[model samples]
Target: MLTIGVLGLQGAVREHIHAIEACGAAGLVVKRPEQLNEVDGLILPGGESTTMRRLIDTYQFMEPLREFAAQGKPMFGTCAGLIILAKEIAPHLGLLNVVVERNSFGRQVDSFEADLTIKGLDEPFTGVFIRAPHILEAGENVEVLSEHNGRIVAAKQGQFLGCSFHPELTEDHRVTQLFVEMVEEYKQKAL
Candidate 1:
């Protein structure tokens, strides 16, 4: 079984685990850096970028998490977690090629649900945006997945994937399944 861990310092943790299981993969939450070795892949769930990065120091997860990402395991970042993974944003894991600016969609009161047409999926995905970030630009290797009003909201770069909204919070779990598939693909190739 493929084991995926959701990085725990986020607003919601258990939901991603459910979605991973729904996608037919084993899932758990990673609280310590050493837990990285136990999972084939990880999900970076939405937490305010300030809290996310500060806790990166608070928990001493910064370099080890970056090391794990460089080790070729796939990671999926959602909303603020997207900012945490962007190279353009500091204290980031710098894996995804997109440039992310936090709170681009405004405050929590300004947040709204968007029906995004994601690439590789025929259906429109209902994504939750809460203090969401926006992707300003993408590098060469990145594949633009979903766009909102012409702004890139979801993207994939090699073994990494990220979205400006929370995919695990809504009914659609296709994005989660796609990441699970990424892990499955990487695991086979890694072997």
Candidate 2:
């Protein structure tokens, strides 16, 4: 079975774990850099990016995470995770090559739900946007998945995927299933 790690630092961990199980994979809570090495994929959950960054330094996980991504390990980041994964986060680290703006949608109260038409999801996905970041710009290599209210939301680049909305908060597993496919594809390529 594919082993997927959920960053335990913060936000929606259980929801993602549940989704992974529903997708027929093993879910592991990853707290250290070493734990990341054992997983075939990783999920960075929604939370405050500032707190997540502090925890990354506290645990020395950034480089190891970058290493994992460099090795083509499939990863999915949501909300704060999306911001962290972007190439150049407008108000934060230029972690991963896409440009992002924190809470670009509005304040915490501005959060809303929408039916988003995604690339692979069967029905319109019920998107839950909290203090979510927006993908203002994506690299040429990134595949745009879905957008809402005229803003960028979901995207994938190579083995990585980022969603501006929280799919874990919903009842659907298609998003996670797609990530499973991505990991399977990665495994095939590695052989």
Candidate 3:
């Protein structure tokens, strides 16, 4: 079975854990660098980006995670996690290098629910955007997955997967299933 880890430094990590397990993978919590070594994939759950970054530093995950990513580990980031994997994040972890607009959808109260027209998904995927960070620009290698209201809400570049909405907050499993497939495909490619 594939072992997937949820970065538990901050955010709704348990949600991703359950989601991953629901998709038939072993869900593990990655709170330390050593935990990252045993996982086939990882998920960065939605939460406050600033807080998560602080935790990353406090828990000493900053360097190790970068090293792990460099090793071509598959990862799925949601909301603030999306901001984390971004190539360029303003006033945040400016490590990913992709341009991202923090809280582009406005404040928490400005949040909205929309059906996303996702690539490869058979039906419109419901997205819950709450103070979400939108990817304004992705690198040439980034594959645009889903869009909402003309903005890039979901995408992937190499092993980094991103989504601006909270899939764990909803009953839908399509998005999580999508990530699972991505991880599985990565395993196949790694062989």
Which candidate number would show the highest TM-score if scored against the true structure? 1
Best by lDDT: 1
Q: Over the stretch 45-125, how does candidate 1's per-residue lDDT look in tens digits?
A: 857778878877899998888888888999888887887888664347677888887775445485788899998889898
Among all windows of ten consecutive residues in candidate 2, which has the lowest summed lDDT? 87-96
Per-residue C-alpha lDDT of model 2 across residues 74-125, encoded as one tens digit per residue = 8888889887777553333344557887774446476888889999887888
Candidate 1: C-alpha lDDT: 0.85
True-vs-predicted CA distance for residue 147, candidate 3, Å: 1.2
Tell me how far the alpha carbon of residue 183 in candidate 1 is from the true structure, in angstroms, after superposition.
Answer: 0.5
Q: What is candidate 3's TM-score against the reference?
A: 0.90
Residue 179 alpha-carbon offset, candidate 3, angstroms: 1.4
Kindly indicate the candidate among 1 and 2 with the higher TM-score.
Answer: 1
Tens digits of per-residue lDDT for model 3 on 1-191?
Answer: 78889988776677777888888999998888889989888888757888988888788887787777777778888888877877553344444446887774445476888988888789898898788887888777778888776888888777778888888777677888888887787788774
What are the lDDT scores of the predictions, listed in order? 0.85, 0.83, 0.79
| Number of residue pairs clashing in candidate 1, backbone atoms closer than 3 angstroms, sequence gap of 3 or more or interchain | 0
lDDT value, candidate 2, whole model: 0.83
The candidates, ranked best first by lDDT, are 1, 2, 3
Two-way lDDT contest, 2 vs 3, winner: 2
